[PDB]
Amino acid sequence: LTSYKQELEELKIRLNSAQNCLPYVRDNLYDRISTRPFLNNIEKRWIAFQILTAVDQAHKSGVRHGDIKTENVMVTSWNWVLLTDFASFKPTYLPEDNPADFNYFFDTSRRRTCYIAPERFVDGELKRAMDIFSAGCVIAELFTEGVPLFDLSQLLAYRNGHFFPEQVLNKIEDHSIRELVTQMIHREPDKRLEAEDYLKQQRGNAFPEIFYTFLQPYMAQFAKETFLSADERILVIRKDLGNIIHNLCENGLVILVSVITSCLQTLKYCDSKLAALELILHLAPRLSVEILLDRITPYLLHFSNDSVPRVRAEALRTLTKVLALVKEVPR
Numbered sequence: 001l002t003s004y005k006q007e008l009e010e011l012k013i014r015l016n017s018a019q020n021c022l023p024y025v026r027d028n029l030y031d032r033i034s035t036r037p038f039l040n041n042i043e044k045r046w047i048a049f050q051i052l053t054a055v056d057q058a059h060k061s062g063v064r065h066g067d068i069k070t071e072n073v074m075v076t077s078w079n080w081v082l083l084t085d086f087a088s089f090k091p092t093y094l095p096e097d098n099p100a101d102f103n104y105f106f107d108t109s110r111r112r113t114c115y116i117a118p119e120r121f122v123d124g125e126l127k128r129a130m131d132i133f134s135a136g137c138v139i140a141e142l143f144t145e146g147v148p149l150f151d152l153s154q155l156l157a158y159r160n161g162h163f164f165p166e167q168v169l170n171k172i173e174d175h176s177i178r179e180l181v182t183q184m185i186h187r188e189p190d191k192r193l194e195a196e197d198y199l200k201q202q203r204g205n206a207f208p209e210i211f212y213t214f215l216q217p218y219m220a221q222f223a224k225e226t227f228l229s230a231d232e233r234i235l236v237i238r239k240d241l242g243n244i245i246h247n248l249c250e251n252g253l254v255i256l257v258s259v260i261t262s263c264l265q266t267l268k269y270c271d272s273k274l275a276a277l278e279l280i281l282h283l284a285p286r287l288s289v290e291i292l293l294d295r296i297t298p299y300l301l302h303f304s305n306d307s308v309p310r311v312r313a314e315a316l317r318t319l320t321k322v323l324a325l326v327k328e329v330p331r
Contacts, residue, residue, distance in 0.1 A: 004089040007125065011063035011086050018057030019220035020050050022074040022082035026262070029073030029081060029138065030109050033145045040291055042254040046215075047073070047081040048139055048177075049207035052195040053216070054083030055135045059194050064126030066090055067116065068134035070141040071109040077262030079255065080223060092127040093120045096159070102152050113141060113148035114155030117188030121159040128193030135195055136184025140165075143172030143181060159187075177206070208251065214244065215252045219259070230263040231272035238279045253286045257296075264299050270308055277303060277318045288326045297323060 012023040027035055029047060039047075051073055055065055065072070067087040074082045090106065094116055107113060115137030120130050140149050149168035150158050157163030165182070172178035180198060203209050218240050222233045237256065244252055260280055267273065277300070284292050300319030304312040 001089050007088040008086055011058065011061070011088060014061030015058045015063045015083075015086075017061050018054055018063070018083070019216075019223065020054030020057055020082050021063075022076075022080070022084040025074050025076045025080070025082075026078075027075055028071050029075055029142060030069070030071035030113075030145075032075050032079065033070060033142075038291060038294060039142075039145070040250070040254055042250040043079050043258065044142060045202075045206055046251075046255050047075070047079060047142060049199070049202060049212060049216070050081035051083065051135060051138060052199040052202065052207075054081070055131055055195045056199060058083055058086060059128045059131065064088075064092070064128050064131045066092060066126045066130035066134055067106060068131060069109075069113050069115040069138045070145070071107075071113065072115075072134075073138055073142075076223070077265065078219070078259035080219065086126065086131075088126055091120070092124065092130050094130075096122050096156065099152055099156065107152060111146065111148040112151030112153065113137065114150045114152055115141075116155060117191075118155075118159045118186070119188040119191075127191065129188045129191030132184060132192045132195060133188050136181050136198075140169065140172060140178065140181040140185055143174065143178055144168055145171075147171040149185070210247070211244065211252060214240070214247070215255060219255070222259070229268065230266060231268045231276075233263065234260070234272065234276045234279065238275070241279065241283065250286055250290065253283045254291060257283060257287060257291060261295060261299060264303070267306070270306075270311055273303055274311060274314060277315055281318050281322050284322045284325075288322075289328045293323070293326060293330070 015021040033039060055068060058065055063086050065083055065086050067090055068083060072085055074084045103112060115134030117130055117133030137149060147168045149165040150163055154163040169178050169182060180201060184192060184198060199207065208215060226233060228236055284296065297319060300315065304315030304319055
């Protein structure tokens, strides 16, 4: 296992280029399924793009995940889906010798989710085939969240020929997304080593073709350890939002709002918060009937409390006026 420790250290050094890797954060992708459970469809697509990018970047850097899963997918306070915990200690073609150890090590969510190629069964270093199988399994799980397409028992039956994920697939709503995730997820005597082809297929329709080139870039840049402060990061976010608007003339607004909330955890400069509201105000045009109402009220109120009378005054004014234009209401 210790040798696998040096292997994982080298894989982390390699994946350093992989901004989609996170070797505390908000939670795991399955944890985000559980706690803080606002898995928006826009966020989902963004998480899928981030996961495909993380797997491809780890592979290219020289990192094979093998056991990518929703539980294994890391997210930050802004839903930063970053691959990590590459199972260099777990077998590439995992032996079926002991299922007790398989549950004790591979599964950490209690759903026994088995993101392993059936060719990883009975007839060193990791393989991109097992990594891609696990990643497709994690994508399908994100499509079904709680539903493990094949648990330890389910995957064992599939390898032995007793379980089929047809049902769990039915958990996923999007037909094309499920189709691609399953095409990734099959018996893998022929290794679909990398997720680059899937990334290319999704960027046409699923992944933002051009928006991500900027959204993903700003996300990685401001991710953490960024020189600019959260308030400075917010001013830069205002600039980048003007840029995105010019590009156009949910999604980022969703993801952008995600990061705004993530940073909102701290106070920093008061006038900084005032501006943030001012900017957060503009973004609402799309999210009015969405995660905005979901938490925009939450922060706007949380923001409108502290000290400064006129500060909280304008804060409530925004919280409302933005809250106003909505024309539909969730229960």
